Design a protein around this ligand. Structure first.
Ligand code: NAG
Ligand code: CL
Ligand code: CL
Ligand code: CL
Length: 499
């Protein structure tokens, strides 16, 4: 009875592990006449319609969303100790109620609810159910405010619909930020009016050659809108000064030797660099950042800064000293990979640490020092949360330069004491990056994203006290029938006792 359990799933059996779970009493049962009651507001109805859409196909029920009556499923905004993202979920024969201070909290509550329901909820046709929700109370709030997932759309391009699909994958686990790697050596994926060829030429191909692609302003705005409806703040990244071949290949004038390199379709890194000695370089950067900021309702702008191996240290420092201020000029908060820690991060900046266990002490120290100096830290270790890394030497996709990363390794650590010498309060959160040198279609993204994606979300959300591999793997194992029913391919790790 994997698909349709006789009894409801435990109230605590959800990912991320809720901060507080108190089971008790009988469960709630959704029946054909259940109404979804919300407050009389645009945002309230929005979360209501979202929930209704998730349930209607499998239940076959009408599930009307209204601001009147005592619906069996109630979503209500009210004062409480749940912050901007927390919520309380009460379940019993009298109905299910999700309470929170803001819509994001109600949305997160819904993500928990879909896990309390049986695997059959993932189907597209009416299912027998039963649509049981364990009885009790859940009070949930996040540990970290930065809980993101990154999708590399530069190595292999993924269109708007494919990005919306990935957005829905991550929304399941309460991630609240979507980092889009919009440019690299193999492609430039966002239209810039001031520099037209970046997209029309720089986005013409991808890894392996053939058709590439890019987002027009309208397409990008739609991705941002959709992400916002899933409560994901979009963090766009235009990598500089390295990983800039797409731009360099588009405008010869940007190159040091004034010669535009060919479009790149390989899978290596570190060979490209903007010419730090030319003034046109900074006009280019200013125009791009200004236009990107205009399309970014979010608070952050990622300027990358990684693997600029063709940029001498001194030039890299000079470059960053000059470009960082540009971000604030357009009202945004700068974010960069941890190499930025060696180039004097400006006030308010955040750096994304992608180091490994084996990374040298000197490098880790430079990052820890930045944290001491007030720089916020986003943790995404290459040997922990890089979803493109192989599980084992036999994995058919992905890379292995950072070693192999099985499910336990990806999950089994604590962000608070990860980077030696780094102040715990400097850690803003975590991120799970999905690089695409080896992934060209949505199904391949899923196989590399699952089952590690939920684990990283837990690290960003759950209390340290709830962290434990032996009990977590049981909760992860329970996701099997849901993913199977949803058509989400995933790596059946032998470390997990799959249900
Ligand atoms: C921040 C950074 O260095 N990014 C690189 C990225 O260019 C590459 O696609 C990936 C392959 O796994 O390795 C990452 O470390
Ligand atoms: Cl999904
Ligand atoms: Cl190559
Ligand atoms: Cl390489």
């Amino acid at each position: 009875d994997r698909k349709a359990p006789v009894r409801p799933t435990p109230l605590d059996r959800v990912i991320p592990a809720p901060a507080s779970v108190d089971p008790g009493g009988a469960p709630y049962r959704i029946t054909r006449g259940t109404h979804i009651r919300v407050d009389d507001s645009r945002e309230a109805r929005r979360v209501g319609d979202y929930l209704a859409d998730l349930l209607r196909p499998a239940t076959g029920y009408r599930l009307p969303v209204t601001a009147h009556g005592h619906g069996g499923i109630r979503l209500r905004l009210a004062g409480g100790p749940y912050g901007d993202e927390g919520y309380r979920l009460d379940s019993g024969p009298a109905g299910v109620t999700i309470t929170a201070r803001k819509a994001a909290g109600l949305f997160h509550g819904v993500q928990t609810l879909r896990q309390l329901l049986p695997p059959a909820v993932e189907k597209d046709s009416a299912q027998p159910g039963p649509w049981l929700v364990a009885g009790g109370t859940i009070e949930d709030t996040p540990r970290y405010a930065w809980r993101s997932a990154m999708l590399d759309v530069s190595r292999h391009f993924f269109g708007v619909d494919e990005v919306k699909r990935y957005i829905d994958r991550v929304a399941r686990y309460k991630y609240n930020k979507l980092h889009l790697h919009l440019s690299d050596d193999q492609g430039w994926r966002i239209a810039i009016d001031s520099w037209p060829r970046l997209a029309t030429y720089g986005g013409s191909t991808e890894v392996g050659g053939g058709p590439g692609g890019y987002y027009t302003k309208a397409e990008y705005k739609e991705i941002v809108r959709y992400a916002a409806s899933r409560h994901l703040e979009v963090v766009p990244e235009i990598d500089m000064p390295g990983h800039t071949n797409a731009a360099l290949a588009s405008y010869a004038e940007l190159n040091c030797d004034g010669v535009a390199p060919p479009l790149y379709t390989g899978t290596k890194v570190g060979f490209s660099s903007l010419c730090v000695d030319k003034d046109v370089t900074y006009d280019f950067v200013d125009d791009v950042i200004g236009e990107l900021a205009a399309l970014t309702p979010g608070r952050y702008l990622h300027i990358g800064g990684n693997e600029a191996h063709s940029t001498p240290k001194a030039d890299f420092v000079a470059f960053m000293k000059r470009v960082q201020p540009i971000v604030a000029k357009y009202g945004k908060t700068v974010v960069g990979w941890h190499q930025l820690a060696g180039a004097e991060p400006v006030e308010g900046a955040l750096v994304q640490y992608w180091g490994l266990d084996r990374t040298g002490d000197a490098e880790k120290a430079e990052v820890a020092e930045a944290a001491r100096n007030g720089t916020g830290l986003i943790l995404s270790p290459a040997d922990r949360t890089y979803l493109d890394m192989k599980y084992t030497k036999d994995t058919p996709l992905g890379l292995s330069w950072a070693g192999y990363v099985e499910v336990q390794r990806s999950y089994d650590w604590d962000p608070a004491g990860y980077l030696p010498g780094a102040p715990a309060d400097a850690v803003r959160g975590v991120e799970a990056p999905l690089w695409t040198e080896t992934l060209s279609d949505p199904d391949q993204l899923d196989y590399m994203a699952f089952p590690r994606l939920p684990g990283v979300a837990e690290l960003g959300w759950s209390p340290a006290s709830t962290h434990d591999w032996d009990t977590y793997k049981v909760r992860l194992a329970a996701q099997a029938p849901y993913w199977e029913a949803a058509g989400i391919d995933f790596y059946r790790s032998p470390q997990v006792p799959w249900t």
